[PDB]
Amino acid sequence: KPYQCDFKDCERRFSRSDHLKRHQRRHTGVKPFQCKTCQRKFSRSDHLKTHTRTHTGEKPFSCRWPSCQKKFARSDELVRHHNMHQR
DNA sequence: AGCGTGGGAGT
DNA sequence: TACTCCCACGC
Ligand SMILES: [Zn+2]
Ligand SMILES: [Zn+2]
Ligand SMILES: [Zn+2]
C-alpha cells in the first residue's frame, strides 16, 4: 500500500490513489457532490446517489420472501431484512 | 426503521 | 481520474 496519508496522526495507507484522495476528505471536510433537490453536500458521489432517494421515494430492492411485499431504497437495508426473516 | 458515511473493490 | 457497487458501522 504505497499511497500513505500524511495528515497529522493518521496512519492509513492505500493500494489506490483514488482511495487515498477519497479518504482525505475526512480530514479536510470537502464535500464535492451536491443534491439538486435540497442542496445538501456530500463527500462521495455514490452516497449522494442513494441520498436522492429520500426525496423520490423509489425503493428498488424488494424482499424475495413469499408473501412479503417490503421494499427498500438501498441494497444493505434488504440484506438486513432478509437476515431478519430467517438465518 | 431509514439513512449518513466510512473501506475495499470492479469497471 | 470518473462512476457505482457491496459490506459495514453507527445513530
Ligand atoms: Zn488520513
Ligand atoms: Zn437532498
Ligand atoms: Zn420480507
Say which residues have a Cβ less than 8 Å from residue A18's Cβ, sequence separation at least 6: none
DSSP tag of A72: E
Method of determination used here: X-ray
Domain A1-87 bears CATH identifier 3.30.160.60? yes
Place of cell 435540497: A38
Q: How many CB atoms lie within 10 A of CB A53?
A: 14
d(CA A46, CA A38): 17
Expressed in angstroms and rounded, the spacing between residue A29 Cα and the centre of ligand 1 is 12
How remote is the CA of residue A5 from the centroid of ligand 1, in Å? 5
User: Cα separation of A11 and A26, whole Å?
Assistant: 13
Contact (Cβ atoms closer than 8 angstroms) between residue A63 and residue A71:
yes
- Cβ neighbours of residue A51 under 8 Å, at least 6 residues apart? A35, A40, A42
Which residues fall inside 7 Å of strand C, measured at CB?
A 16-18, 21, 44-46, 48-50, 74-76, 79
Give me A57's grid cell.
421515494
Provide the resolution (angstroms): 1.4
**Domain spans in chain A, listed from the N-terminal domain onward:** 1-87
With residue A79 as reference, give the H or E element that holds it.
helix A75-85
